[PDB]
Design a protein around this nucleic acid. Structure first.
Ligand SMILES: [Cl-]
Ligand SMILES: [Cl-]
Ligand SMILES: [Cl-]
Ligand SMILES: [Mg+2]
Ligand SMILES: [Mg+2]
Ligand SMILES: [Mg+2]
Ligand SMILES: [Mg+2]
Ligand SMILES: [Mg+2]
Ligand SMILES: [Mg+2]
Ligand SMILES: [Mg+2]
Ligand SMILES: [Mg+2]
Ligand SMILES: [Mg+2]
Ligand SMILES: [Mg+2]
Ligand SMILES: [Mg+2]
Ligand code: NA
Ligand code: NA
Ligand code: NA
Ligand code: NA
Ligand code: NA
Ligand code: NA
Ligand code: NA
Ligand code: NA
Ligand code: NA
Ligand code: NA
Ligand code: NA
Ligand code: NA
Ligand code: NA
Ligand code: NA
Ligand code: NA
Ligand code: NA
Ligand code: NA
Ligand SMILES: [Sr+2]
Ligand SMILES: [Sr+2]
Ligand SMILES: [Sr+2]
Ligand SMILES: [Sr+2]
Ligand SMILES: [Sr+2]
Ligand SMILES: [Sr+2]
Ligand SMILES: [Sr+2]
Ligand SMILES: [Sr+2]
Ligand SMILES: [Sr+2]
Ligand SMILES: [Sr+2]
Ligand SMILES: [Sr+2]
Ligand SMILES: [Sr+2]
Ligand SMILES: [Sr+2]
Ligand SMILES: [Sr+2]
Ligand SMILES: [Sr+2]
Ligand SMILES: [Sr+2]
Ligand SMILES: [Sr+2]
Ligand SMILES: [Sr+2]
Lengths: 115, 246, 119, 145
RNA sequence: GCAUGGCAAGUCUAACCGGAGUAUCCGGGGAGGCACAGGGAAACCGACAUGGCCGCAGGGCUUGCCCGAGGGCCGCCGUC
RNA sequence: UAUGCCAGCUGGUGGAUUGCUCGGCUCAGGCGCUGAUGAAGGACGUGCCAAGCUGCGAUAAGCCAUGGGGAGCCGCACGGAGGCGAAGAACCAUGGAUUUCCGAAUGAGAAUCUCUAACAAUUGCUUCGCGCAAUGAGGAACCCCGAGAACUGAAACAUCUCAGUAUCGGGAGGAACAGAAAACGCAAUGUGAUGUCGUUAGUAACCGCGAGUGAACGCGAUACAGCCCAAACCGAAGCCCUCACGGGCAAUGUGGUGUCAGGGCUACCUCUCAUCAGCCGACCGUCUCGACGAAGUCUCUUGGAACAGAGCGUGAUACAGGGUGACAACCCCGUACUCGAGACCAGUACGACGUGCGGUAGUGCCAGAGUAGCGGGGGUUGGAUAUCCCUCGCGAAUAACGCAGGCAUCGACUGCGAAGGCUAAACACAACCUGAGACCGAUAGUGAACAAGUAGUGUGAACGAACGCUGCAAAGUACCCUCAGAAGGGAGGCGAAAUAGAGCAUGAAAUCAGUUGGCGAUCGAGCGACAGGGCAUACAAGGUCCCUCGACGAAUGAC
C-alpha cells in the first residue's frame, strides 16, 4: 500500500527487468522496496567508500545520504539521494537513479548491493 | 521547453522558455495532501453546549418502585444519554484541533508538482477541462492585466479555442442534502485559472468556474482544485517567469 | 448576508419604508427609455400586464397595493367565491409589468424623472 | 477499515467479559498506584541518589571530534590554508551559549592540521600531531594548571 | 509502537511580522526542541569514517571457486 | 361452519419517514458601563371591540422637531366597524416632550398602599442653613481584595491530593491589576519599568522522597514611556467658594525649589528643545449603516403554474445569497464597482505656548522606623537553610550609611537605594452589534422554532413540560335534502389535488373495523430451517418446467 506513484512504478519496472532480463537483483531490490519504509536503506557515503569497487555499480535499495567521504570513482544507483549526497558523489564518480540503471543494464550484472 | 506567447487578438507573438518547475514530476498524492490540509485549515471549530442536558437536579429513585434506576425529575427521565432530553454522550467538541500540519518543504513540492501538471495537455483533459488546443498552459502578453471588460476576456478565450471550458462550468448543480439549509445549495465545475502578476484579473474573475490568482501566491488548490492535478491554466508573460522560482 | 435564513428573515421582517422595494415591477420598453430605469414601485394608479400566472396576458389597473403582504390587486384579475361573489386574486409584482404610470403626484414624477434617484 | 470501525455488534469492544472495563480497579489504582506493591515490576526502584550542583556553577563545554573537522577540510575553504589552519571556534555550532570549545579525538585525521581551541583531549593531540599537525591552546584555553 | 510521506547529519518551526484572493493561503520568523558522544553522584575525563573470522541475499567465474552490503562471533576504544 | 390462526386488500388510529426551517449550537470581528437628574427590575394601567405578547405611561401600540421615505397606513393578527394620510401619514435616524406605584428607595410606615414637609443614613465643604456635594443599587462574564470546603486521588489513610477549586463577604472598570529597580546575577567590558504570548520545562525546587505538586532568570515576540512627592534651601510669595462685595483654608506650612542622568547651598561655565503643564487637533484604518447599480421575462412543447426541455438572444469590476405558482446572472431584492454618514482608533499623533536640559569645584545641609534585621507560633509556596504573608516579642544605621547577588559570619567584588505616590499601550470577558459554519434539523438542536421560564408542581428556596407544515390563490364550501340542530350526514360547488377541508405536505410500525386467500370445532406447544405435496395468483419488474427416447456416464454396482 505505497502512496508515492513513482515508487510504485519503479517497483513495477524493477520487476519487469528482473523477469525479462538475466537479473535477480532488480527483483530482489523490488522485494525490499515493497517492504515498509523503515526497513529501506539509509546509507551515508562513508559506507559506499568502504565496500564499493570501481566498474562495479553500487545499488542502494533505499536513499543515499551525505555523511562521510567518497573518493572511489563509482556509479551509485539509489531510489534517491540527498542534495549533498548527489553532489559529493558526482564529484568523484556518478549518481544515478534505479530507473536509469535498470535501462542501462536490464540484466543487472556486475553490481553490488549496499545498505 | 518553449511556450508560445499570445496577444489580445489571440495571434502568436513570439515565445519563451517554459521554466524548469513545469518539468517537476507530477505527484498526485502530495498534491492531494496539500489540498486536504488547506481545506481542513479553514473549517470552523464547533460543538454542542457543554451543559446541554445537565441543567436539572434529576435524581434516580434507586430500587423499590419497580423502576429502572434512571435520574428523574417531575416524573420525567433526564440528564443521562439514553434519556430523551438527556446529554449527548460523546458530542462534537470545541477543544478539538481540526487543523492539519504540513512541512513547508513537502507543501512547496506539491505546488511545483501542481504547476507541472498544468503543462501536460493529456492530464488537463483527463481532469475534465474542455478545449481544442494542443499546447498548454496558455501564455499571454502582460497586456492581459490591463483588460477591464469580462466579454473582452471572452473574445480572447474564444480566439484561443479555450472558451469551451467556461461553457462547461456554465452549469450549476443544486446539491442533494441539507447543505442547502445552511447556504450551500449550489456547486459548479472548476474552469480556467488565470494567473497574472500585479493584481488578480478583475476582468476574468466572473467567468463561470473561473479562478484568478497572482504568481507570487497561487497555491495548490488553485492549480489542482479538489486535489485533482492538471487545471487548464492561462498565465501572464511575467506571471510565468515569476512563478518559476516558487 | 449569504445565509438563506438571514436573507428570508431580513425580507419578512423589513420595516414599512423598506417594503416598497418588495412591490417593484419591471417597466415596459418605452417607459424604461422614457425614465432611464428598468423597474418601478407599482402604485394603485398604474396599469400593468400579467406575464406569468394563470392570468398571464391580461392587462389592467392596479386597484390596491398591500405592503404588509407585499402583493397587489389588479382590476379583473379575480377568483369566484362559492357564494358567487368575485374577489381579487393577489399578485406578486415580479410577475407583472407596468405599461402606464399614474403621475398625479409631483414627487413621484419628479423622483422618476430625476437621474441620481429612481422611483 | 480500522479496528474501531469494526467493534459495533461485538458488545465488549475487545474488553473480554463485560465486567472488566469499569473504574480504576481495572488498572490497579490510578496513575502510578502500586509501584511498590502489586505493580512493582519494571519500575525504577525507590530512593534518593546523589546531588546536584547549582546551575550557575555548572560549565557546558561545546565539543567536536577531529573526524567532523577533518572530513570537511576542503569544504571549509572559508578557513586558512597554510603549509590547514582552523580555529575550531569558528566551526562549532552552539559555540556561543557554551563556556568553551573542546576538541575531542574521535575518528581519523587524514590531513595535517593546526587547530585552535580552548581545550583538547589527549587523543585529540596525539592524532593531530601524528599527522604532522599542531594544536594551539587559546588564551582562554590558558586555564590548565 | 506501527503504516505512509518530506527532508536528512540534520530536521521542525512557536509566538509573532509582511502580503493577499483577508480565519484559507504566499512569504518571513530556527527563539527553542529533538538528533549529531558517552561515562560519572560529582569533580572531571572523553570513543571503531574498521583489525580478525564466519556467512544470508546479491554479484562475479572458466559452475565447485571468488567478492561478499545487512547479519553473526570476536577483538579493540571512551568512562565509572 | 361458529370462537379463531397466518398473510394481504380497503378504511381508520398513530405520527415514523422523506422533504422544508422564522429556532438553536459554536466560532470570529466590533463594542462596552448604568443609577438620587431615582437605574436595572417589578406592579398596575393604557386599544372602538382586546384575553395573550409587544409597545407605551393618566399626553399611556403613543406627542413634538429636523433629515430620510413615500401613497399608503391604523404592531404580532389574513375581523367587523370606523378613521388617518398631498396641511405629505405610515415607516426609519437623530434630538426633545410625557414618563402612575413599588423598587438603592431616601419624611414616617406598608406584601406595590397609607399617614403628617422631608438628600433617610453616613460623610466632605460649609455662607454652620441639607446651602453646595459624595455614597447606596444594577450589569453576561471578565477583574481586584478578603473567607475558604468535601466528595476524590494516594487503589486503606493521617502529611500530601482534589485546590486556593466550589461556594461565601467586599469593591472598581470598560477592561482590571501591575509598573520606572534597595531589579537581574546567561558573573559580565552584560541586561535595563510593567503586563501578556511562545519557549526556557515537567527543567530547578517540593514530596509517607510515595502518589503527586512545580517555578524563575534568559531568549523570540507583542506593545513601549516615563514621571510626581517628603526633606534640604526659601517662608505667605498660595489655594477654594462667590459675578462682586465678601467668606473659608493656611506658620501643626499654602506656595517656590527638588526627586539617583541625586538634590540643596556657596562660586562659576554653558545653555535650554529634556521634562512637566495647558492649547490645537487629524490622516489612515476598522466596524456598522446608507445611496447608486448592467443584462430576456422572447418562440414551441409539457404543466394548475415555466424557474423544465428544445430553439434564439444578453450582461458581467455583478456566475455571493434570497424571493417569485418547479433547476432564474439577465422577473424582484440584492451582488461588483463607486460614493456618503456615524462610531471606535483619539482629545491620541502631529503642531504650537510656556518652562528650561546639562557641566566643574567646594560643602559629613537633605533623602520616608516599630521600619531593615532577629527570635517564638501559624499559614502558604517549587522555594528547598535559599518563597510570600499573618501573629506575639525584640529592634538599627544615616549615604563616610544601607540593602541585594538562593545557608550563617567577616573581607573583597558587582548591583541597587526600601520603609511616599502616579502612569498610556500590548492581554481578559461577551452583555450588546455584525458576520460566519465538513455543527443540529422539531423525541434533534437551548429547558424554550409554538403561550417559554409559558402551562403546571412546592409553605418556600426552588422545580418545570408538550405543541412547527391547507392551498398557486381562501377560491376557507353557495343552494338543496335530512336532523331537536351554526352539530353531523347526504347531494353539490372550488382547486392539478379535498385520500390538500383546519395539529388540514408525506402518512411507517404497533394496532382496530370490514373483507380476500389458505387452515379450522378428534386434536398438541420456540411458532421455524431444509425437502416435498394441496389450494391461491391481472400486467410490470423473473422464464422456465415436465414426460418418451438418445448422448455422456464418477464413486458405486446387479438380477
Ligand atoms: Cl551509513
Ligand atoms: Cl550537577
Ligand atoms: Cl541579562
Ligand atoms: Mg438534548
Ligand atoms: Mg437525505
Ligand atoms: Mg429616473
Ligand atoms: Mg416610603
Ligand atoms: Mg483513597
Ligand atoms: Mg496545600
Ligand atoms: Mg502508598
Ligand atoms: Mg499546587
Ligand atoms: Mg531568577
Ligand atoms: Mg426540544
Ligand atoms: Mg396530513
Ligand atoms: Na432546568
Ligand atoms: Na479547536
Ligand atoms: Na465491558
Ligand atoms: Na535553531
Ligand atoms: Na458593546
Ligand atoms: Na390584547
Ligand atoms: Na419613555
Ligand atoms: Na444624595
Ligand atoms: Na447642611
Ligand atoms: Na482507593
Ligand atoms: Na475508606
Ligand atoms: Na508530602
Ligand atoms: Na543569549
Ligand atoms: Na416572478
Ligand atoms: Na515571625
Ligand atoms: Na541584586
Ligand atoms: Na416536536
Ligand atoms: Sr433493598
Ligand atoms: Sr405589519
Ligand atoms: Sr401581518
Ligand atoms: Sr483488547
Ligand atoms: Sr462511574
Ligand atoms: Sr496500573
Ligand atoms: Sr514492597
Ligand atoms: Sr540557538
Ligand atoms: Sr523550515
Ligand atoms: Sr560488521
Ligand atoms: Sr521600553
Ligand atoms: Sr529614600
Ligand atoms: Sr555565600
Ligand atoms: Sr413530538
Ligand atoms: Sr444552551
Ligand atoms: Sr417539601
Ligand atoms: Sr361532496
Ligand atoms: Sr461406464
Amino acid at each position: 500500500s505505497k502512496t508515492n506513484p513513482r515508487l510504485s512504478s519503479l517497483i513495477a519496472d524493477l520487476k519487469s527487468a528482473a523477469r525479462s532480463s538475466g537479473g535477480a537483483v532488480w527483483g530482489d531490490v523490488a522485494e525490499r522496496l515493497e517492504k515498509p519504509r523503515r526497513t529501506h536503506a539509509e546509507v551515508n557515503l562513508g559506507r559506499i567508500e568502504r565496500y564499493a569497487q570501481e566498474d562495479e555499480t553500487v545499488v542502494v535499495p533505499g536513499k543515499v545520504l551525505g555523511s562521510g567521504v567518497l573518493q572511489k570513482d563509482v556509479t551509485v544507483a539509489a531510489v534517491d539521494f540527498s542534495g549533498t549526497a548527489e553532489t559529493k558523489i558526482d564529484q568523484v564518480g556518478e549518481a544515478v537513479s534505479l530507473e536509469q540503471a535498470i535501462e542501462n543494464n536490464p540484466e543487472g550484472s556486475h553490481v553490488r548491493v549496499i545498505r | 521547453m518553449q511556450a508560445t506567447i499570445y496577444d489580445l487578438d489571440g495571434n502568436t507573438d513570439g515565445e519563451v522558455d517554459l521554466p524548469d518547475v513545469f518539468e517537476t514530476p507530477v505527484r498526485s498524492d502530495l498534491i492531494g495532501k496539500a489540498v486536504r490540509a488547506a481545506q481542513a485549515n479553514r473549517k470552523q471549530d464547533y460543538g454542542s453546549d457543554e451543559y446541554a442536558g445537565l441543567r436539572t437536579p434529576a435524581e434516580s429513585f434507586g430500587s423499590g418502585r419497580g423502576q429502572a434506576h434512571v435520574p428523574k425529575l417531575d416524573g420525567r427521565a433526564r440528564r443521562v444519554p439514553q434519556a430523551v432530553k438527556g446529554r449527548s454522550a460523546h458530542p462534537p467538541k470545541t477543544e478539538k484541533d481540526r487543523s492539519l500540519d504540513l512541512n513547508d518543504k513537502e507543501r512547496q513540492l506539491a505546488v511545483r508538482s501542481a504547476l507541472a501538471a498544468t503543462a501536460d495537455a493529456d492530464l488537463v483533459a483527463d481532469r475534465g477541462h474542455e478545449f481544442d488546443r494542443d499546447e498548454v498552459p496558455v501564455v499571454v502578453s502582460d497586456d492581459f492585466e490591463d483588460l477591464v471588460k469580462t466579454q473582452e476576456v471572452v473574445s480572447l478565450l474564444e480566439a484561443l479555442d479555450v472558451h469551451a471550458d467556461i461553457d462547461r462550468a456554465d452549469e450549476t448543480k443544486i446539491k442533494a442534502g441539507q447543505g442547502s439549509a445552511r447556504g450551500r445549495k449550489y456547486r459548479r465545475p472548476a474552469s480556467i485559472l488565470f494567473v497574472t502578476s500585479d493584481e488578480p484579473s478583475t476582468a476574468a474573475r466572473n467567468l463561470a468556474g473561473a479562478d484568478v490568482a497572482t504568481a507570487s501566491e497561487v497555491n495548490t488548490e488553485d492549480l489542482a482544485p479538489g486535489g485533482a492535478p492538471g487545471r487548464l491554466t492561462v498565465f501572464t508573460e511575467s506571471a510565468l517567469a515569476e512563478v518559476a522560482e516558487r | 448576508s449569504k445565509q438563506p435564513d438571514k436573507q428570508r428573515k431580513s425580507q419578512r421582517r423589513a420595516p414599512l419604508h423598506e417594503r416598497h422595494k418588495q412591490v417593484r415591477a419591471t417597466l415596459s420598453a418605452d417607459l424604461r427609455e422614457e425614465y432611464g430605469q428598468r423597474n418601478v414601485r407599482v402604485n394603485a394608479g398604474d396599469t400593468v400586464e400579467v406575464l406569468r400566472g394563470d392570468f398571464a396576458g391580461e392587462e389592467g389597473e392596479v386597484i390596491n397595493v398591500d405592503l404588509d403582504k407585499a402583493v397587489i390587486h389588479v382590476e379583473d384579475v379575480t377568483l369566484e367565491k362559492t357564494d358567487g361573489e368575485e374577489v381579487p386574486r393577489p399578485l406578486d409584482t415580479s410577475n407583472v409589468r407596468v405599461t402606464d404610470l399614474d403621475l398625479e403626484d409631483e414627487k413621484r414624477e419628479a423622483r422618476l424623472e430625476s437621474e441620481d434617484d429612481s422611483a | 477499515t480500522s479496528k474501531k470501525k469494526r467493534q459495533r455488534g461485538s458488545r465488549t469492544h475487545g474488553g473480554g467479559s463485560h465486567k472488566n472495563r469499569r473504574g480504576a480497579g481495572h488498572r490497579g489504582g490510578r496513575g502510578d498506584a502500586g509501584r511498590d506493591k502489586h505493580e512493582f515490576h519494571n519500575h525504577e526502584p525507590l530512593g534518593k541518589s546523589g546531588f546536584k550542583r547549582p546551575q550557575k556553577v555548572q560549565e557546558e563545554a561545546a565539543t567536536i571530534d577531529v573526524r567532523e573537522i577533518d572530513e570537511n577540510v576542503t569544504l571549509l575553504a572559508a578557513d586558512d590554508v597554510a603549509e590547514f589552519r582552523v580555529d575550531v571556534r569558528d566551526v562549532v555550532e552552539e559555540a556561543d551559549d557554551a563556556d568553551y570549545v573542546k576538541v575531542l579525538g574521535a575518528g581519523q585525521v587524514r590531513h595535517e592540521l593546526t587547530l585552535i581551541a580552548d581545550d583538547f583531549s589527549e587523543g585529540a593531540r596525539e592524532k593531530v600531531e601524528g599527522a604532522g599537525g599542531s594544536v594551539e591552546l587559546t588564551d582562554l584555553g590558558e586555564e590548565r594548571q
